[PDB]
Amino acid sequence: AKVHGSLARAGKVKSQTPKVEKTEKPKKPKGRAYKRLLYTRRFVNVTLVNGKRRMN
Amino acid sequence: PRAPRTYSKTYSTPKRPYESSRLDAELKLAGEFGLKNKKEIYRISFQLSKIRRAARDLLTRDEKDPKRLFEGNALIRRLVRVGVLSEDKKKLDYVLALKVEDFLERRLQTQVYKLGLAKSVHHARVLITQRHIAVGKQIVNIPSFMVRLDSEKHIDFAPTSPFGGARPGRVARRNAARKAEASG
Amino acid sequence: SVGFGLVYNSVAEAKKFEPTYRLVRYGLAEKVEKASRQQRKQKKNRDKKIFGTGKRLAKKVARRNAD
Amino acid sequence: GKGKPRGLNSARKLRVHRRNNRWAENNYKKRLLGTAFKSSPFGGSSHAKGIVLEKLGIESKQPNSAIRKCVRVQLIKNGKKVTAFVPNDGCLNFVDENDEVLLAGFGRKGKAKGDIPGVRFKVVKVSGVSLLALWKEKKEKPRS
RNA sequence: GGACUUUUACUUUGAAAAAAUUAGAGUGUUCAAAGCAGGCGUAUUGCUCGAAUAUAUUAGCAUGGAAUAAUAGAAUAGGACG
RNA sequence: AGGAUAGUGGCCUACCAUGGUUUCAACGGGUAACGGGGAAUAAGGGUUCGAUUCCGGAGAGGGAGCCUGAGAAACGGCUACCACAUCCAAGGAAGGCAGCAGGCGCGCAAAUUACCCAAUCCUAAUUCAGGGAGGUAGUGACAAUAAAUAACGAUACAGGGCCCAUUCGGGUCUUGUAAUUGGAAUGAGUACAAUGUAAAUACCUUAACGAGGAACAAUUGGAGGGCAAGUCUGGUGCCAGCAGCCGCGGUAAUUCCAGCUCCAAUAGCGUAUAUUAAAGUUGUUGCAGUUAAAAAGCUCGUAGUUGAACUUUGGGCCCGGUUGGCC
Ligand SMILES: [Mg+2]
């Protein structure tokens, strides 16, 4: 196949995207405590039940 | 050039990585028993399978076989000793199908909850980790301890610790000293 | 705390049977002053080359030291 | 009688007949023939180091329209020329010239990965600084 | 101690098949991977259970069986008992 | 028959005979081959691996030769040749790290020029001396075991029975959340001391000091399907790029680049190569051969495999054991 081309567009979209910074949030429990957080939210709370139990 | 140290691994991951049935079932065990891992769950499935493997092969042997009698009763006695196998079930067939979480019931973390003193499984785990437990007269900080159904009555607070006496505690000392130092 | 203890019939048997390392840990005997292991080996290999006392060679090189 | 001999003294016929039909398997024939040692420009190893010679703008197979941004690398232990892919969004800027790169396969075991025609390897490092980490600005390419 | 003793395959049992490793019995490494320890007393004199067993292709050796699959026997009879 | 050997033997010599192995795979070639105990994965069968903690071989840069000794074809012994290479006041002399550290190269790939004989044991004339054998420490995310990153009260919302059944009032009791509030608990990390060990560093103890988030802050990968987890927002617009496979991207991208949210494993997670299962896609168990790949054109025919039936069977007499069985 043809090997030539145009390298001038390398990383074209990586540069054009705007820079957006990490929104600060309180840190999440890690380890066993996160198991509580997952347990209560999806096996006790039924809030995210939008049409199909949509959590996102 | 030295005698090698034997070592084995104590868990095995499930074949299917992503299925709703197993993932929702394991999380039930995690919250109900206060486990930090699925590896905490895979460990029992590894031991239960090995126990089930031994009983499965011994049952194929004919009855009154000296090997079946010796190892069958030893396996039943060991399981009965830790309480995972009830006293009325000693027929080498209830061993096969006990449960996934029958062993998980004898864990010291969830065993503390049964004998009060924690009012949550999470509280029981940290109390164990923070040295405030003495199964006998010796301190233990391992949540998975597999009480032998004879030390169950001896599970009390650690004598050389707060909630056992002989010290008001670390931060309570700071609070108590704060009142004493600011009283004048 | 669980440990091992030994008691002797007298101090004569205590010094003659206990190892030197434990006796110096107790003060009964004084630790001997010894150089490094590598220096002793290097010293042992150095004087292997010379044959005999070496006093004759010691003065022979002194005559060579003049010239 | 279903083909195969069934006699109790016919182990030699069964043992020999399996061997001749073992060669029909692609994997068994490849392993015994040792084609990986005598071909497949690696020495049968997971990764191999090389020197970037040029930069390439290889096209993409239909249906696809893209420039694949590969490089022509010459292995050190063998001296053979191979084409290596630079996988990330615009990391050809880090492989300028004469860079000692660490290559790896595409996970297809000798076959071309995708719409990229006739390449089998990808770049992992440039001058040993974890080419992926450069894309995430966790490191910096050395001056020399 | 003696005379011949039709020979095989197969299978049961037994000895053999280093240790470590595999399985497995007992036991405080605080649990566990481990290790082969350890436990009990008047602790002032001391007592004591362990460190088994299982597995170990095929080849070689001894023993019982003798179905299954072969082998030979007395037929131009130096055939057997005597 | 004799020599040689510590001895048997074409081991070698003289004479003599023509013998010996082979389709039951000789001989030759390859091995990215030291052999086993063993390791990985496995319903059963099997497949792959074994340089490497034990046993047995062989080697000391490649060969050959030999002294000493009970024991060596010895190399931290010697001699010669070849190939490397050291110092030389140029006549000469001295070398073998596949021993422990350490260096250069080779590479995708692998550690300190540390301490000690205190344990295990070895050696000698021998209790003492020697031992880079060996042990201790350092580097060490090769692999494995355990297990931190948080726990609990009361106020305020949001539920379920139930007291009243006096409207829509308070709520006895539970389960979650708050830019709600409160005191507890302990370890990583500093360290007096003791223990530790040949001396130490560590471990197990332990004076004292040692949580509050902006903190003592958990990562690696993903969110179309396989494979749960977005049709959320901004950017790009068949460009950049993603994508193991099917595919995505041409101005409404749940697949690219970013933010938000969610998910999986978690002090671990991803990738490449090889291998095992999946694979009844090597099939003895257990494949397929009319049309998907595959019955030789047909017949004879050795080695190989397989090969009809039949020879003491039945009935009685007792003796002595194991599982029960009311007792
Ligand atoms: Mg024939």
Swiss-Prot record, chain A:
<dbReference type="Pfam" id="PF04758">
    <property type="entry name" value="Ribosomal_S30"/>
</dbReference>
<comment type="subunit">
    <text>Component of the small ribosomal subunit (SSU). Mature yeast ribosomes consist of a small (40S) and a large (60S) subunit. The 40S small subunit contains 1 molecule of ribosomal RNA (18S rRNA) and 33 different proteins (encoded by 57 genes). The large 60S subunit contains 3 rRNA molecules (25S, 5.8S and 5S rRNA) and 46 different proteins (encoded by 81 genes).</text>
</comment>
<dbReference type="GO" id="GO:0002181">
    <property type="term" value="P:cytoplasmic translation"/>
</dbReference>
<keyword id="KW-0597">Phosphoprotein</keyword>
<comment type="similarity">
    <text>Belongs to the eukaryotic ribosomal protein eS30 family.</text>
</comment>
<keyword id="KW-0687">Ribonucleoprotein</keyword>
<dbReference type="GO" id="GO:0005829">
    <property type="term" value="C:cytosol"/>
</dbReference>
<keyword id="KW-0963">Cytoplasm</keyword>
<dbReference type="GO" id="GO:0010494">
    <property type="term" value="C:cytoplasmic stress granule"/>
</dbReference>
<feature type="modified residue" description="Phosphothreonine">
    <location>
        <position position="47"/>
    </location>
</feature>
<dbReference type="GO" id="GO:0022627">
    <property type="term" value="C:cytosolic small ribosomal subunit"/>
</dbReference>
<dbReference type="GO" id="GO:0003735">
    <property type="term" value="F:structural constituent of ribosome"/>
</dbReference>
Swiss-Prot record, chain B:
<keyword id="KW-0963">Cytoplasm</keyword>
<comment type="similarity">
    <text>Belongs to the universal ribosomal protein uS4 family.</text>
</comment>
<feature type="domain" description="S4 RNA-binding">
    <location>
        <begin position="106"/>
        <end position="180"/>
    </location>
</feature>
<dbReference type="GO" id="GO:0042274">
    <property type="term" value="P:ribosomal small subunit biogenesis"/>
</dbReference>
<keyword id="KW-0698">rRNA processing</keyword>
<dbReference type="GO" id="GO:0003735">
    <property type="term" value="F:structural constituent of ribosome"/>
</dbReference>
<feature type="modified residue" description="Phosphoserine">
    <location>
        <position position="183"/>
    </location>
</feature>
<keyword id="KW-0694">RNA-binding</keyword>
<dbReference type="GO" id="GO:0019843">
    <property type="term" value="F:rRNA binding"/>
</dbReference>
<dbReference type="InterPro" id="IPR022801">
    <property type="entry name" value="Ribosomal_uS4"/>
</dbReference>
<comment type="subunit">
    <text>Component of the small ribosomal subunit (SSU). Mature yeast ribosomes consist of a small (40S) and a large (60S) subunit. The 40S small subunit contains 1 molecule of ribosomal RNA (18S rRNA) and 33 different proteins (encoded by 57 genes). The large 60S subunit contains 3 rRNA molecules (25S, 5.8S and 5S rRNA) and 46 different proteins (encoded by 81 genes). Interacts with snoRNA U3. uS11 interacts with MPP10. Component of the ribosomal small subunit (SSU) processome composed of at least 40 protein subunits and snoRNA U3.</text>
</comment>
<dbReference type="GO" id="GO:0022627">
    <property type="term" value="C:cytosolic small ribosomal subunit"/>
</dbReference>
Swiss-Prot record, chain C:
<comment type="subunit">
    <text>Component of the small ribosomal subunit (SSU). Mature yeast ribosomes consist of a small (40S) and a large (60S) subunit. The 40S small subunit contains 1 molecule of ribosomal RNA (18S rRNA) and 33 different proteins (encoded by 57 genes). The large 60S subunit contains 3 rRNA molecules (25S, 5.8S and 5S rRNA) and 46 different proteins (encoded by 81 genes).</text>
</comment>
<feature type="compositionally biased region" description="Basic residues">
    <location>
        <begin position="56"/>
        <end position="67"/>
    </location>
</feature>
<comment type="function">
    <text>Component of the ribosome, a large ribonucleoprotein complex responsible for the synthesis of proteins in the cell. The small ribosomal subunit (SSU) binds messenger RNAs (mRNAs) and translates the encoded message by selecting cognate aminoacyl-transfer RNA (tRNA) molecules. The large subunit (LSU) contains the ribosomal catalytic site termed the peptidyl transferase center (PTC), which catalyzes the formation of peptide bonds, thereby polymerizing the amino acids delivered by tRNAs into a polypeptide chain.</text>
</comment>
<feature type="compositionally biased region" description="Basic residues">
    <location>
        <begin position="37"/>
        <end position="47"/>
    </location>
</feature>
<feature type="region of interest" description="Disordered">
    <location>
        <begin position="34"/>
        <end position="67"/>
    </location>
</feature>
<comment type="similarity">
    <text>Belongs to the eukaryotic ribosomal protein eS24 family.</text>
</comment>
<protein>
    <recommendedName>
        <fullName>Small ribosomal subunit protein eS24A</fullName>
    </recommendedName>
</protein>
UniProtKB/Swiss-Prot annotation, chain D:
<comment type="subunit">
    <text>Component of the small ribosomal subunit (SSU). Mature yeast ribosomes consist of a small (40S) and a large (60S) subunit. The 40S small subunit contains 1 molecule of ribosomal RNA (18S rRNA) and 33 different proteins (encoded by 57 genes). The large 60S subunit contains 3 rRNA molecules (25S, 5.8S and 5S rRNA) and 46 different proteins (encoded by 81 genes).</text>
</comment>
<dbReference type="GO" id="GO:0000462">
    <property type="term" value="P:maturation of SSU-rRNA from tricistronic rRNA transcript (SSU-rRNA, 5.8S rRNA, LSU-rRNA)"/>
</dbReference>
<dbReference type="GO" id="GO:0022627">
    <property type="term" value="C:cytosolic small ribosomal subunit"/>
</dbReference>
<dbReference type="Pfam" id="PF00164">
    <property type="entry name" value="Ribosom_S12_S23"/>
</dbReference>
<keyword id="KW-0687">Ribonucleoprotein</keyword>
<keyword id="KW-0689">Ribosomal protein</keyword>
<dbReference type="GO" id="GO:0006412">
    <property type="term" value="P:translation"/>
</dbReference>
<dbReference type="GO" id="GO:1990145">
    <property type="term" value="P:maintenance of translational fidelity"/>
</dbReference>
<dbReference type="GO" id="GO:0005840">
    <property type="term" value="C:ribosome"/>
</dbReference>
<feature type="cross-link" description="Glycyl lysine isopeptide (Lys-Gly) (interchain with G-Cter in ubiquitin)">
    <location>
        <position position="55"/>
    </location>
</feature>
<dbReference type="InterPro" id="IPR012340">
    <property type="entry name" value="NA-bd_OB-fold"/>
</dbReference>
<dbReference type="InterPro" id="IPR006032">
    <property type="entry name" value="Ribosomal_uS12"/>
</dbReference>
